[PDB]
């Protein structure tokens, strides 16, 4: 889930920012160009906790830009395969449930859930429901569920989920 890993980046700095505040500019460019990128190698980086060091800035021959290797401690969320996490549902549909586990959306199949959770048509809150109305999942509810798989779209990594274990319901 949420991790604290030190990792790497390469900042290209234009010769505009070669004054008294270039190291500050490298810090702000690391924040601007790292915080929010959806890498496949490390999942979701949420916030850069701190700067370990700003490396030696090699001047690129013929380009003018200076390449700085930046090492940074960052908060990183990564949805491992086969894990049980609590999502927030955002859309109901016959093909499945669209939930939102935070930075990412998530798809849950109609046959991957237990066979007691059926669709509720022509209701002002649309939802899946049980016939005895034991648990109802309307908009903005918390749902424990087991994500079964993770695949990389390189822009926003979504996970497919299911509900075949105990307690995987509303909290």
């Amino acid at each position: 889930m949420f991790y604290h890993i030190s990792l790497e980046h390469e900042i290209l700095l234009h010769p505009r920012y070669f004054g008294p505040n270039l190291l500050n500019t490298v810090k702000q460019k690391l924040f601007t160009e790292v915080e929010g990128t959806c890498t496949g190698k490390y999942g979701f980086v949420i916030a850069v906790t701190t700067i370990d060091n700003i490396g030696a800035g090699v001047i690129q021959p013929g380009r003018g830009f200076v390449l700085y290797p930046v090492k940074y401690k960052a908060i990183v969320f990564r949805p491992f395969k086969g894990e049980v996490v609590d999502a927030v549902v955002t859309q109901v549909n016959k093909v499945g449930l669209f939930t939102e586990i935070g930075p990412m959306s998530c798809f849950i199949s109609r046959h991957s859930i237990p066979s007691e959770m059926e669709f509720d048509p022509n209701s002002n809150p649309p939802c899946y429901k049980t016939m005895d109305e034991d648990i109802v999942i309307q908009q903005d509810d918390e749902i424990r569920l087991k994500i079964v798989g993770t695949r990389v779209d390189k822009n926003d990594i979504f996970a497919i989920g299911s509900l075949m274990d105990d307690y995987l319901g509303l909290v």
Binding site: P114, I135, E142, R144, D166, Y167, G169, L170, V171
Partner: peptide, 8 residues
């Protein structure tokens, strides 16, 4: 399948 915790 049994019910777990709530929130309040």
């Amino acid at each position: 399948l049994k019910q777990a915790s709530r929130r309040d």
